[PDB]
Amino acid sequence: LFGAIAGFLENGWEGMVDGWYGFRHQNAQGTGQAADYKSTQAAIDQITGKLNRLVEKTNTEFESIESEFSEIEHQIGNVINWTKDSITDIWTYQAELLVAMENQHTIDMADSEMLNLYERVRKQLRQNAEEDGKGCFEIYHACDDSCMESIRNNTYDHSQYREEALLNRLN
Amino acid sequence: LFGAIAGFLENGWEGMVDGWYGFRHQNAQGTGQAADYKSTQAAIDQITGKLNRLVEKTEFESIESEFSEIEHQIGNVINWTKDSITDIWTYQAELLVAMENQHTIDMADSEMLNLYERVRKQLRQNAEEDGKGCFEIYHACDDSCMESIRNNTYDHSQYREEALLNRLN
Amino acid sequence: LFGAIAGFLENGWEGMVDGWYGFRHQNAQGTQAADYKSTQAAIDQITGKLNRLVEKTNTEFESIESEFSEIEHQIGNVINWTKDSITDIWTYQAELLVAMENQHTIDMADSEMLNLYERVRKQLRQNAEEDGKGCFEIYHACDDSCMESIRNNTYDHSQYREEALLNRLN
Amino acid sequence: DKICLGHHAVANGTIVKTLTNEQEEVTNATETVESTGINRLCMKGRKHKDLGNCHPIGMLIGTPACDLHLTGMWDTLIERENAIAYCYPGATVNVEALRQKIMESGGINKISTGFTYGSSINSAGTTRACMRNGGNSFYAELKWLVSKSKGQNFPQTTNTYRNTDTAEHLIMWGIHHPSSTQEKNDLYGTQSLSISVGSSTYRNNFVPVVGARPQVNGQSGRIDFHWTLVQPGDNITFSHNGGLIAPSRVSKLIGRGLGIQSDAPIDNNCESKCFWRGGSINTRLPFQNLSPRTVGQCPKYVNRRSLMLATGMRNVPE
Amino acid sequence: DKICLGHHAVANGTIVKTLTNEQEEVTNATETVESTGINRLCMKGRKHKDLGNCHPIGMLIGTPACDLHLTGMWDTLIERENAIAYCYPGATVNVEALRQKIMESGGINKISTGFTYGSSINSAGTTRACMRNGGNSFYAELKWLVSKSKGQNFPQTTNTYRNTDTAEHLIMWGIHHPSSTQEKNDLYGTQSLSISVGSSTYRNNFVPVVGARPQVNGQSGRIDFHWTLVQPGDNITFSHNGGLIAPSRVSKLIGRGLGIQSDAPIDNNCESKCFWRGGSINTRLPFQNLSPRTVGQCPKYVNRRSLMLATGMRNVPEL
Amino acid sequence: DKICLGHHAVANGTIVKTLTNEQEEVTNATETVESTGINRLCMKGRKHKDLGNCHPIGMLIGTPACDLHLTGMWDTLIERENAIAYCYPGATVNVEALRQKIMESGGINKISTGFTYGSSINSAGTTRACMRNGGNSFYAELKWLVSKSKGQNFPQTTNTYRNTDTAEHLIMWGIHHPSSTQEKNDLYGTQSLSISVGSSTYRNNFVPVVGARPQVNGQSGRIDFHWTLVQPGDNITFSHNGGLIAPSRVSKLIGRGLGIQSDAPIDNNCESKCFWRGGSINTRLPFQNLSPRTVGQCPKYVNRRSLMLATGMRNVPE
Ligand SMILES: *[C@@H]1O[C@H](CO)[C@@H](O[C@@H]2O[C@H](CO)[C@@H](O)[C@H](O)[C@H]2NC(C)=O)[C@H](O)[C@H]1NC(C)=O
Ligand SMILES: *[C@@H]1O[C@H](CO)[C@@H](O[C@@H]2O[C@H](CO)[C@@H](O)[C@H](O)[C@H]2NC(C)=O)[C@H](O)[C@H]1NC(C)=O
Numbered sequence A: 001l002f003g004a005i006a007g008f009l010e011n012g013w014e015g016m017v018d019g020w021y022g023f024r025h026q027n028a029q030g031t032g033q034a035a036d037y038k039s040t041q042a043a044i045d046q047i048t049g050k051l052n053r054l055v056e057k058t059n060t061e062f063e064s065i066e067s068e069f070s071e072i073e074h075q076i077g078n079v080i081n082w083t084k085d086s087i088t089d090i091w092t093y094q095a096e097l098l099v100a101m102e103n104q105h106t107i108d109m110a111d112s113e114m115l116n117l118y119e120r121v122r123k124q125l126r127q128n129a130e131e132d133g134k135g136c137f138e139i140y141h142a143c144d145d146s147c148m149e150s151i152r153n154n155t156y157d158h159s160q161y162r163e164e165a166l167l168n169r170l171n
Numbered sequence B: 001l002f003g004a005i006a007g008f009l010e011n012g013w014e015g016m017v018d019g020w021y022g023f024r025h026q027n028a029q030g031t032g033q034a035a036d037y038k039s040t041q042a043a044i045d046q047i048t049g050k051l052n053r054l055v056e057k058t059e060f061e062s063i064e065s066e067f068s069e070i071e072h073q074i075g076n077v078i079n080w081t082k083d084s085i086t087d088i089w090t091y092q093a094e095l096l097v098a099m100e101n102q103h104t105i106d107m108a109d110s111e112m113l114n115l116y117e118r119v120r121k122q123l124r125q126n127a128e129e130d131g132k133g134c135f136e137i138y139h140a141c142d143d144s145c146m147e148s149i150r151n152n153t154y155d156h157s158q159y160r161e162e163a164l165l166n167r168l169n
Numbered sequence C: 001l002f003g004a005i006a007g008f009l010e011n012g013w014e015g016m017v018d019g020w021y022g023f024r025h026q027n028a029q030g031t032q033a034a035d036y037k038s039t040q041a042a043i044d045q046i047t048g049k050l051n052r053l054v055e056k057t058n059t060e061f062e063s064i065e066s067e068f069s070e071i072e073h074q075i076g077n078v079i080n081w082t083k084d085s086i087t088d089i090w091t092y093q094a095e096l097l098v099a100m101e102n103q104h105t106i107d108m109a110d111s112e113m114l115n116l117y118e119r120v121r122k123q124l125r126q127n128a129e130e131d132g133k134g135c136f137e138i139y140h141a142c143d144d145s146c147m148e149s150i151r152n153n154t155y156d157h158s159q160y161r162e163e164a165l166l167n168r169l170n
Numbered sequence D, F: 001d002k003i004c005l006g007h008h009a010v011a012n013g014t015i016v017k018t019l020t021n022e023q024e025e026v027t028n029a030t031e032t033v034e035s036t037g038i039n040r041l042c043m044k045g046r047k048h049k050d051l052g053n054c055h056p057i058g059m060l061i062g063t064p065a066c067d068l069h070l071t072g073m074w075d076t077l078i079e080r081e082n083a084i085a086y087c088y089p090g091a092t093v094n095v096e097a098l099r100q101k102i103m104e105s106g107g108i109n110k111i112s113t114g115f116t117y118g119s120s121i122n123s124a125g126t127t128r129a130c131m132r133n134g135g136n137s138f139y140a141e142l143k144w145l146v147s148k149s150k151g152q153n154f155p156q157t158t159n160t161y162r163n164t165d166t167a168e169h170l171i172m173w174g175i176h177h178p179s180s181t182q183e184k185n186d187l188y189g190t191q192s193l194s195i196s197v198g199s200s201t202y203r204n205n206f207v208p209v210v211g212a213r214p215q216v217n218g219q220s221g222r223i224d225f226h227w228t229l230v231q232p233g234d235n236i237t238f239s240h241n242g243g244l245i246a247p248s249r250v251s252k253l254i255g256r257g258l259g260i261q262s263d264a265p266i267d268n269n270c271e272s273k274c275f276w277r278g279g280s281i282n283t284r285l286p287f288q289n290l291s292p293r294t295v296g297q298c299p300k301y302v303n304r305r306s307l308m309l310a311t312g313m314r315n316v317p318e
Numbered sequence E: 001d002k003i004c005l006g007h008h009a010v011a012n013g014t015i016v017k018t019l020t021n022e023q024e025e026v027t028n029a030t031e032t033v034e035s036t037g038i039n040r041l042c043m044k045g046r047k048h049k050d051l052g053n054c055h056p057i058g059m060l061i062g063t064p065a066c067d068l069h070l071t072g073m074w075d076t077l078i079e080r081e082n083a084i085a086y087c088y089p090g091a092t093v094n095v096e097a098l099r100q101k102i103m104e105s106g107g108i109n110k111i112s113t114g115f116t117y118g119s120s121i122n123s124a125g126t127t128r129a130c131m132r133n134g135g136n137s138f139y140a141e142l143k144w145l146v147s148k149s150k151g152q153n154f155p156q157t158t159n160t161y162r163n164t165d166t167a168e169h170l171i172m173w174g175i176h177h178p179s180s181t182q183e184k185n186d187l188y189g190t191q192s193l194s195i196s197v198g199s200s201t202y203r204n205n206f207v208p209v210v211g212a213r214p215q216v217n218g219q220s221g222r223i224d225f226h227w228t229l230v231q232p233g234d235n236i237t238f239s240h241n242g243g244l245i246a247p248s249r250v251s252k253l254i255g256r257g258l259g260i261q262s263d264a265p266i267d268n269n270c271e272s273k274c275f276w277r278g279g280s281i282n283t284r285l286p287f288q289n290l291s292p293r294t295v296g297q298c299p300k301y302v303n304r305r306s307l308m309l310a311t312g313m314r315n316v317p318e319l
């Protein structure tokens, strides 16, 4: 697990219904929302990849060894029942393991793509911002609507605002 | 693997007896040790989760007589099958324990890192990392204030101004 | 996925060959090495995976069906059903084993890559800044013996603190 | 000025199981175990044969119920619950092996034995137990041989069937066991009955036995059936005294097919690869809980009602 | 002024295996494979029957070792290693399928055939090989038919068992194979012997055969047994003239039970759901290495002494 | 002034499968499924017997093809494709179980039965179908007993083999089934023929049956073989009229060994523990796709051609 989704992010946003991961902002000219296509698509490719593996199964052909409609000799019938049940225990166990193991990795992978976005933004803002610890960045300069989009763009040039921010931070 | 356990933390604390994870502090008032409750319950819950899956429980009847002659060809078939089943279970069990052990070890690791990350972000600019799992605190932090850190009730802004100056000269 | 390989690092270093993880230089004089401890920890874990694989407590099996004559039809059909059932299981086992195993090997390579990065982040302390692409823009001088101080895990930050703080803050 | 980061959530979440947690809520999930099956045999694109009330054995000996299924070609063969193999009561040795061989076949052809019988013998024995156009009949590929005159000793008789084909053939005959000394005397005489059958690879002797018995289809005698495979270029000879139910045709199983035992009606406009007693199964899912006895190319049977696979993140509602 | 973060550790750790390291020190671990069984048969809660030295088949034909095991109800049936099936030597056809039916049953009732014989027949044939009160007896559910007048021809005889019940019955009979031509003549006469048996679903003929053989329980003759199931409302008829060892009673296997082969002593105080030869297994763990051949609701057998599940973090003590 | 962290890559990467990704490029991988096998039988360190054209049944019975294989000791017994069991036409009841028992063995010794026949019995009966050097012969371990004087009734005869050893012996005998009523009379007489065989744990009876049958190796008659294990301290008694093909020696199967059916050449340099029809399989890998039918200490057979296991990181080329 990464400390994010059931961790330092307090909860999820029920209102975000274009993305898996997103930004909310608040500058002086309003509050807005936006989803991040890159990281959500990263996580969805990994989901459809699992699902592919799950259905991407080709099968052996089996014939009947048990008569539906007539009596089978007692001893050979007992062997067949032991084998058949024993194979089923193996498959039932295998399916349970498959799903429990793959659900674990899925929950944690989603969490890693959540964190990987947070880290990207953090390294991007550089000395211009500080984090509270609920997943927010307190920015120490005037961030325009076109500046906000710049952070989401990965456009943002930290050097452009650095001095105003460093000044604001230190006092 | 997350960096903390058997990583940037150099060793464990045998002095810690009721917590998986915890704190040591040094200030004017002396030292102390505290275990963190939530982070260790977080680990212990996942352990007893694997234990519960483990012990979750088909009826089988006899197909080879113990006390008498079983026809040769059918007996070869039963031994072949039964040994084949045993190889599968033996492989399944070796795999289960090996994969779960790896995950257990790394989740433990994960829980240690998340505590450390929680504190780090909570100290904000009032502290720095030594790279050994310690935080050098650039103000005076009496016992009641060390505690507030273990509480998540520490307000960084309280000490910020004093801290930043202490960090610059 | 930790953030590094195929992550914030743009690509690998084909030119680097003496390890899996290294550094690249720049200063007065400067221009590549390799971390021994980090690429060993990684490699050590691949060879552990390899040993489990070639681990062979093989059970002795004999023939239950003849190659060179007709077996009785009903019991042959049970043998076929069983053998086929057993092979489906091992094909499933095998495929799952390496897909799961592969997932973990890749992601662990990522962990060791990151762990070195953060070890350096924490060393450099305040005397440097992360560029977001894997590098540490440094705000004092060093020196090519100082860089060796970074790699060798001996670097004293407070030795160069003042010098580099004023270079970041003015 | 703040920029914040977050994930989504939903009101109605889904519960899945993990390695550490049995009750874990996620944004989304899907089934991995199929529970719904088609109540039809999906036979489209298959050259199939629905036997109806003809038992596969009845194909070889030629029971009235099997008159529409004496010869044919198929890749899939369907046996039903009400299937008749015997009109005149009786049994077959190694019946399950034989039934399995028929149900793995891809068709049957028939070939005359060419057997012919002197005037002492009546080939045309019929019985009320096999009915055919309102009239008493008999198995279509066999002949009930008796003494033309009612009490006379059946003559010592020899018949040989020669397999001049390139493939092996499958030959069936019967042995009559009368229910009474009078029934026996009348059919074959008072003499001492015996039947040998020999070929390169088969050898056996049979003796009719009189015994009293309950009536089945109004008949108290029985006919036990025997079979063997006659190789290419090989011959099988019948030496007999009365009691032999003789083959007038032999069989040739051809190719390979998938045999199916089912309740379900046929749907020839539907495609499938997986079958069971209740019908068909068409699914992308790796597992299934409808039937532990399936046939064909099938998902694997698991003892669970459901196994939900997460396709979303942890659901943490506001 | 500083604050430090850390994890516990312990002095004496335990080793587990992981995917990448087979020697990994951890703070705790627990077994996943049972190694200790109870060497007793834990029959608590179970209405059981210990057959002692009675073999299952012997319950059907009434071997004297089985006199206290001719009827009963049970949910667990226990078979012991040298159990007696035959006093008079012989064999049963499809004995193993028959043993397994019995061992899967939840009881046995006995229904009388009501067979009755003419005065030229002696029904009460006995033999040194079946003893009761230390004197000559015979299988309790069967009767050794012989010519009452030594040497005379056994009358052509017919007997029909009718099942008027609502469930199938199990019928057993024997065919006697004498060891000498004189013995054969004495008992049944000089005629050709022949025994036919037919129901609606069963048909067979049988011919007694004379042959010299070793003595077994002091006897060179042999009784071979046969059996078949008789459906409700069906009748089964025996046509014979010497050699038939006739059923006087028929069995009905009732319900379902678990069958155990073991010589472990019964313990009526502990309960269990898993059994094998050397007793009982009682565990929460999903694997066991006690035995590859178990019975009931058992953990899966694995060829491994031990498998440790890490139940704690990497143990890292100080230098 | 900077320091930069990074990882290696390689020009040519290897594609693997993961949970989330088929077609994932990596800097290295190793195969987990063994697909290459040795065309030969690697017999190094193994004390072995190569039967050649001798069938295992023929070792007990003494078929002339098996003369150099009547006794011996082995690790490993190897059976070839068209091996001869019989010279005089016939077959064996429960032959596949019998064959398995011999291929599970570690060696055979032979023990004389000390059987002895009266003056009215010629026991050196031979046949054109069993050639040794130029001449008519017979199974080496059996004896064709016939009336010394053609057409006379074979005497009522008793022979008893006593196992005085501390281990079970395997005894085989034959029953002769003549081609013609004439052949029977010539060897045995006109009496009814009967053969009974009885130990403490076995009893059976055989009646020779005259029948017209095709000729196999120029012979219309047959000999059918029967067998059983005689326990220590037990005696087995043969009672007969003619038609018994009597054992002159019995067998003792000894220890345990590995039976291989293959048409591969032996190779004593190469070592191995796993065998199939086409040879040997020597590999570290836990999976193979060469053959689903193997014997020995084998890797598990899987359907896939390849399963690459990653041994490097993601390959990220510039
Ligand atoms: C089983 O036996 C009974 C009696 O022998 C048969 O039923 C009877 O039919 C006869 C003639 O119709 C009557 O004389 C009897 O009184 C009947 N018995 C009863 C109880 O009604 C019955 O047909 C036989 N079953 C079979 C399948 O043959
Ligand atoms: C099956 O019967 C045929 C016909 O009797 C046998 O073949 C004949 O073979 C012999 C010698 O091989 C020839 O001399 C005849 O000319 C053949 N007859 C015909 C019309 O083909 C054949 O040998 C028998 N099969 C066996 C195995 O006995």
Ligand SMILES: *[C@@H]1O[C@H](CO)[C@@H](O[C@@H]2O[C@H](CO)[C@@H](O)[C@H](O)[C@H]2NC(C)=O)[C@H](O)[C@H]1NC(C)=O
Pocket: E214, E215, F162, F200, F233, F234, F235
């Ligand atoms: C097998 O035959 C031998 C001899 O025919 C039997 O053993 C003899 O055993 C009796 C009883 O102890 C002794 O009185 C004789 O002296 C023994 N004779 C010899 C020469 O050993 C033996 O009982 C028979 N075995 C079986 C199982 O019937």
Ligand SMILES: *[C@@H]1O[C@H](CO)[C@@H](O)[C@H](O)[C@H]1NC(C)=O
Pocket: D028, D029, D030, D311
């Ligand atoms: C729910 O999961 C299914 C299966 O992955 C998917 O088809 C569907 O898109 C998911 N729901 C939403 C709202 O995405």
Ligand SMILES: *[C@@H]1O[C@H](CO)[C@@H](O)[C@H](O)[C@H]1NC(C)=O
Pocket: E027, E028, E029, E030, E311
């Ligand atoms: C060891 O682990 C077991 C099982 O989880 C537990 O019952 C016990 O409390 C643990 N104690 C130690 C550290 O020995």
